[PDB]
Design a protein around this ligand. Sequence first.
Ligand SMILES: O=C(O)[C@H]1O[C@@H](O[C@H]2[C@H](O)[C@H](O)[C@H](O[C@H]3[C@H](O)[C@H](O)[C@@H](O)O[C@@H]3C(=O)O)O[C@@H]2C(=O)O)[C@@H](O)[C@@H](O)[C@@H]1O
Length: 228
Amino acid sequence: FLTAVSSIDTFLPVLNEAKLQWPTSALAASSEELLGGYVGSQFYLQDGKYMQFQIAGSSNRCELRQMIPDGGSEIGWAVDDGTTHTATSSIVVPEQVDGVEEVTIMQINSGEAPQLRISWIRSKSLDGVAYEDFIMSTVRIGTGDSSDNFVKTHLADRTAGAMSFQIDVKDSKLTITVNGNVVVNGQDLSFWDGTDSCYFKAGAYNNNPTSESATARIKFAALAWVDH
Ligand SMILES: O=C(O)[C@H]1O[C@@H](O[C@H]2[C@H](O)[C@H](O)[C@H](O[C@H]3[C@H](O)[C@H](O)[C@@H](O)O[C@@H]3C(=O)O)O[C@@H]2C(=O)O)[C@@H](O)[C@@H](O)[C@@H]1O
C-alpha cells in the first residue's frame, strides 16, 4: 500500500499549481487529480515526508509541470516580463542504480527549448575538470546542438542529506542557490527575451540511461513555485 503525496499538507500548494506527466510528456494527470489522491509507484509519499518520483527508460519522466493555480490552464511566462519567477526545493538524491546516467530534477522549459535543467550527473568533465556524482546546471544560450549553445556548471557534489535549491529569474537574468550558497549569479537569459511560454518543472526526467530498465529515483522534501 502506497501513501498519496496529497495525504499531508506539505506539497498541496505546489500540487494546486501543477500537472503530472508520467511516463512521457503527453500522458498527464491534472492538478485536480493530484489533489484528489493520485498515487502509484511512480509518485508516492516515502517515509511520511518525501514526494518521491521514479521512472525508467530513455527520456521517460515522472515530472510536475507548472500550471496556473486553482484549476488553471498551462502557465507561460517570460524571462523579461518584469516579474521574478522563483522555484524552491529541498531534494534528497539517493544513490542512483547502475544504468542511470543523468536525471533532470528541476527545469525551466518552454515551447522552444529548455532554458535551464538542473540534473544529477554520474560523471562528466567540465572546463577541464572531472566531476562525479554531482548536480549540474545546463543553460541554453542558443537553439543549436553543439556545446557552444550551452553553459554547464558544477553546482555541488551529491550529498547524503537534503539539498536546497532556489532558482530565480528576473529581468532576463538567472541566479541559482544551492544549500544557501550562490552557485550561479546573473547568468544571461536574454536570448529568450520575448519567449512567453516558459514554465517550471520538477521531478525525475531520465536522460541517456545505459539500461532501459534502470529506475531513476528522486525524493523531494519541499517544492514551491512563486511569482513576485
Ligand atoms: O559533452 C557534452 O557536454 C555532452 O553534451 C551532449 O549534448 C547534450 C546537450 O549538451 C544537452 O545536455 C542536451 O540536453 C537535452 C536533454 O538531455 C534532454 O533530452 C531535453 O531536456 O533536451 C535537452 C536539450 O536539447 O537542451 O542533451 C545532449 C545530449 O546528447 O545528451 C553531447 O554533445 C555529448 O558530446 C556530451 O554527452
